[PDB]
Amino acid sequence: MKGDTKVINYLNKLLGNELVAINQYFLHARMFKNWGLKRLNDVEYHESIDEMKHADRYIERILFLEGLPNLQDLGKLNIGEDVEEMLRSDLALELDGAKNLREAIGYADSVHDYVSRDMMIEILRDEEGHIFWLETELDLIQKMGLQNYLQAQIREEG
Amino acid sequence: MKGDTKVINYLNKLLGNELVAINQYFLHARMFKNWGLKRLNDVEYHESIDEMKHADRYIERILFLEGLPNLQDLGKLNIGEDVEEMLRSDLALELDGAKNLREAIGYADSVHDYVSRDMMIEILRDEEGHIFWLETELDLIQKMGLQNYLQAQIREEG
Amino acid sequence: MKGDTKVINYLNKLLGNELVAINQYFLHARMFKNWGLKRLNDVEYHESIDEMKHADRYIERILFLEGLPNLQDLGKLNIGEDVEEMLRSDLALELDGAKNLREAIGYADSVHDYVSRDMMIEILRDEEGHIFWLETELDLIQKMGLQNYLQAQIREEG
Amino acid sequence: MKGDTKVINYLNKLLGNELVAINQYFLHARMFKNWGLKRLNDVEYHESIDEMKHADRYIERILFLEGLPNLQDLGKLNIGEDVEEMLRSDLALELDGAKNLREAIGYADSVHDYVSRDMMIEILRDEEGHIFWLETELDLIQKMGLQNYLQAQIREEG
Amino acid sequence: MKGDTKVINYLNKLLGNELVAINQYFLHARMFKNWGLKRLNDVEYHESIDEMKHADRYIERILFLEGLPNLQDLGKLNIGEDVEEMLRSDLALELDGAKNLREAIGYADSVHDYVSRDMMIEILRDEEGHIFWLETELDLIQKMGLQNYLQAQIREEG
Amino acid sequence: MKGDTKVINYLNKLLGNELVAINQYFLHARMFKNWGLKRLNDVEYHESIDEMKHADRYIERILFLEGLPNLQDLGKLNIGEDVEEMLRSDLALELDGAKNLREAIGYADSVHDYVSRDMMIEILRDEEGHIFWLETELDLIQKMGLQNYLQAQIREEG
Amino acid sequence: MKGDTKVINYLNKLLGNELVAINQYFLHARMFKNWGLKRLNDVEYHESIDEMKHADRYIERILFLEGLPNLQDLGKLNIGEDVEEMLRSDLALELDGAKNLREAIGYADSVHDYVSRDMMIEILRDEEGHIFWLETELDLIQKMGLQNYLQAQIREEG
């Protein structure tokens, strides 16, 4: 079903955001894992998987709307070197991504692509949940100190 | 069954205490939650629920005794800005409420409303249990230091 | 995550509405219960519980957006003296609340806070379901007469 | 298998009756439901479903006999404005349809289409069961009065 | 609850679209069945059922909003004579309907009927899923040829 | 444990191959899905997942050996436009990847990194299995013709 | 089956390494246990058991190849006096052992004793897993501090 050209462009831009997040979160997860921070590995790895699910939704929607998914261009990753820097990088990435989503959601509404909009709002809802988690962790590092914080990550939280 | 007017006035005063506590504990709970202090959220939230149950008992008793439950007047909340201030505020609230409960229990006995008294003694027993928990938590903050204390709250206890 | 100030003000206004409904529905329920109208107590009590859930959603959303939930100011309750007056009062409360919600949902859209909007639309949907029930019960009082209507409430509808 | 042309015309006429009943009973059901008359909604909705099953049998039979099912022409609905008027309209509809069925069954026998006849007699048996329920309900409205009658519909009849 | 008059008119127009689709899909289904194309009968029949569910939602919403559901006027059916023509007819119907849905969704938003809007968006999401299926099947007819396509329909897919 | 620098360079090169395959196979998969070729979607999607697992093994091994995983550089994808072209592109990618693996396996042996070698041989064994599947499917397209081949993909194989 | 004499000498040397590790890890384990460091006792004890399993494989392989297993000569143990020193001693022991293993694996290949080689690669894979754990724990001591580190060992991890 032929979709709006600019909606398809937005979907490819958002897909682009997801491809960056997938790689950044996956590497951060395994860096966490390599440092023995099992709890952070677990959360970060599942964020990575969650972004794959988002990318999948963008890809299928683009194909349905008869556009061409772009998995070729990969934006800049920002891999941190310590736990706080890594989480702060994820947070900045999520905030950038949420700005893009808001714009796309607004535009999709204006050209009456309510199904694309509905999908993006669900994804945005997922992203704000991740933003909440990040902000909380970043504050906890300051509140309990880095040594306690790292100690709180070495066992899985199940 | 027409009750003693002053007993009903006491029950409305105690109900008023409960209405303040319900709101104060519920907001403190979600503030804890927003900070990632899942254990404190869990306890604080269930205290709020417990105060709803106490309010319910007062409301039903007042109606049975043919009085008019007053849910319209809401006393002063004292919302804290950090964990210790919030727990100290809850404790002061509990101690004030216990003073009121003691007065009512004495008065109900004097006019032979033993069923109202029996109800209030159970509630007082619940409140001293809460007072015990608060005093213990406040002492632990001092004994293990705030950083260790916050760390001990980020996972649910169960 | 720093939210829009006017959205946060809307959320606090809506929270204020919920705090009124919680108390109004709770007292109405126990009045129904005190009269032996078990069916009405059951529905009314669970509406009270449902408004607590709505308040909870507003409170968590406000805290996330870094605003201050206001549980201190309690609006006017309108407690009825007979079944029809109580239900009509609940209905007026719901209709007033729905106007406020519609306005907030519109504005949330205009500043691209689609997650707050999504939350509020779910709540509005709950409220219109409650309005449907109220309108139905009020009509049934007139159609079967008050004596039959009351008789129909004295046993639980499981 | 090439059927009798006039038999096919009868089946299309009967299908036409079913299409009317489907819509009339479906709307009547949801009007009942909207008024809180759950028992009537339940029965009326299932009659609508049963008329769909009848329509289905006609459609399949017509196609087998190599005729063209007519779903395009929709006869007059008679939507009532109150419960008694709605049930009396359903009853008149059933009686008109039973007349049509009797004529078709007689003709089908006459041209030796015994399988179409057998199908139609099963449907006629279903309809007389519905006519029985309607006559009963209409009599009960008079015998117990409308207020009692409506009270008896507000709960599901297990 | 008195709704917006034009929203109600939209809902009746959409209900009208559904009434056409119910009949068109039901007849197409049984034509498929009569040809031995069991897989197409199964999908097409369940589309008809799905459109009945959509109609039900419109009817109940209209009644809640105190309007009058119109089940009397039936728009033009376009019954195909071979498989490709039938599927293309369904597809044109779905596309026409999606246009109406988009228009209604935009208008409901403008008068703050967010619950009617939310219902319609769910329905639009369903229809685009049906549009996807239709486009796929039509392409498969071209890609594998009609003889292979028909062979692929004669057993149930499950 | 500080690894051999050139081994780490090989692992990053092989990771790079995996990153291309992950994206190429995922897009091909959903293209198959969009075409209704359910069997091909299922296989292609699971190949994509298998390459993610391989990438995961490289990333963890690089980190253990104290190198820096490179997820930033993404090589050329070769997305096909029809089924045969897509499978041939996958096959060329796999053959290129196997050449790189053979080189790396030889080199790792020469510097006594037997654990890296052992890991790569397992991965090579997986890739040759995929190569077998691709070559088989490509031959089958020619042997049964494209129309029969496409028909054989529209149902899941399980 | 008469084996290569030099391979057998390698197997006896590696067996000697295992005999040192078995005793060193067992004593470190019970020293940990005596200090109340239950998590470390658990891991260290199971490493000792794993080295017994490795020794067992060497002994059986040596006897099969018709050599004489040497369990008489025991190399130098390096028992640490505090947790960090003990772990660093284990790590140095593992690294020395891996050097010997790589050499033996290389030589087994040159004389085509591929089964001895295959056994040794599995053991090497085990040892690098142990090296990973050791490096991680040593880094965690510095990152969270010894006091937090010790606190993190007093309960079993399972």
Residue numbers in the entry:
A (entry chain F), B (entry chain C), C (entry chain D), D (entry chain A), E (entry chain B), F (entry chain E), ...: 1 to 158
Provide excerpts from the study:
Bacterioferritin (BFR)2 is a bacterial member of the ferritin family that is composed of 24 identical subunits and that is distinguished from the other members of this family by its ability to bind protoheme IX at 12 intersubunit sites. The subunits of BFR oligomerize to form a spherical structure (outer diameter ∼120 Å) with a hollow, central cavity (inner diameter ∼80 Å) such that the Met-52 residues of adjacent pairs of monomers coordinate the heme iron by means of bismethionine axial ligation. Each subunit of BFR possesses a dinuclear iron site (the ferroxidase center) that catalyzes the oxidation of Fe2+ to Fe3+ by dioxygen to endow the protein with its characteristic ferroxidase activity. The three-dimensional structure of BFR reveals the occurrence of eight 3-fold symmetry channels, six 4-fold symmetry channels, and 24 B-type channels, all of which are potential routes of iron entry.
